[PDB]
Amino acid sequence: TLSNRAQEFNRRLTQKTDNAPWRRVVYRRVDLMEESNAVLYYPPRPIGDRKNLFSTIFGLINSNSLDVYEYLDGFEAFTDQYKIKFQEFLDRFGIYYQPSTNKNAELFKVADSDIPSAEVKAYYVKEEWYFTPTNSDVDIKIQAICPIMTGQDEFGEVRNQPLFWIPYENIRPYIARERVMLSSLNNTRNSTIDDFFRLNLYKGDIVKTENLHNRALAEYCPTPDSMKMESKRIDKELQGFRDGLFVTQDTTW
Ligand X SMILES: *[C@H]1O[C@H](CO)[C@@H](O)[C@H](O)[C@@H]1O
Near ligand X in 88-127, by CB under 6 A: none
CA gap 84, 190 in Å, rounded: 34
Site for ligand X contains 3 (CB under 6 A): no
153 contributes a contact to a copy of itself by CB under 8 A: no
Q: Is 211 in the site for a copy of itself (CB under 8 A)?
A: yes
Q: Confirm or reject binding of residue 194 to ligand X (CB under 6 A).
A: no
Q: Where are the alpha helices (DSSP H) in 63-180?
A: 87-90, 168-175
According to DSSP, residue 61 is labeled H
The residue among 47 and 199 lying less far from other proteins, judged by its C-beta, is 199
Residues in the chain: 253
Contact indicator for 128, 24 with CB cutoff of 8 Å: yes
Return the residues of window 208-247 that contact other proteins according to CB under 8 A: 237, 240-242, 244-247
Give CA angle at 63 (60, 64), nearest 5°. 100
- Tell me which H or E stretch contains 123: strand 120-131
| CA 80/CA 64 separation, integer angstroms | 14
Q: Is 135 in the site for other proteins (CB under 8 A)?
A: yes
Region of 1-9, 37-45, 100-108, 134-142 interacting with a copy of itself (CB under 8 A)? 37-45
Nearest to ligand X of 47, 229 (CB atom) = 229
Q: Is 98 in the site for a copy of itself (CB under 8 A)?
A: no
* C-alpha span between 250 and 252 (Å, rounded): 6
Nearer to ligand X, 75 or 253 (CB): 253
Q: CA 47 to CA 195: how far, in whole Å?
A: 22
CB of 48 to other proteins, least distance (A): 20
Closer residue to a copy of itself (CB): 186 or 252:
186
Stretch that binds ligand X, among 91-99, 158-166, 180-188, 221-229 (CB under 6 A): 221-229
Rg of the chain taking only CA atoms, in angstroms: 20
Name which of 58, 227, 32, 44 is nearest 122 in CA terms.
Answer: 32
**Cβ neighbours of residue 227 closer than 8 Å, sequence gap 6 or more:** 205, 207, 217, 218, 221
> Shortest distance, CB of residue 233 to ligand X, whole angstroms?
7
Residue 230 binds which entry of a copy of itself, other proteins, ligand X, none, with Cβ cut-offs from 5 to 8 Å by kind?
A: ligand X
Query: Measured from the CB atom, is 79 or 249 closer to a copy of itself?
Result: 79
Among 15, 63, 64, 187, binds a copy of itself (CB under 8 A): 187
Return residues touching ligand X (CB under 6 A): 220-221, 226, 229-230, 251-252
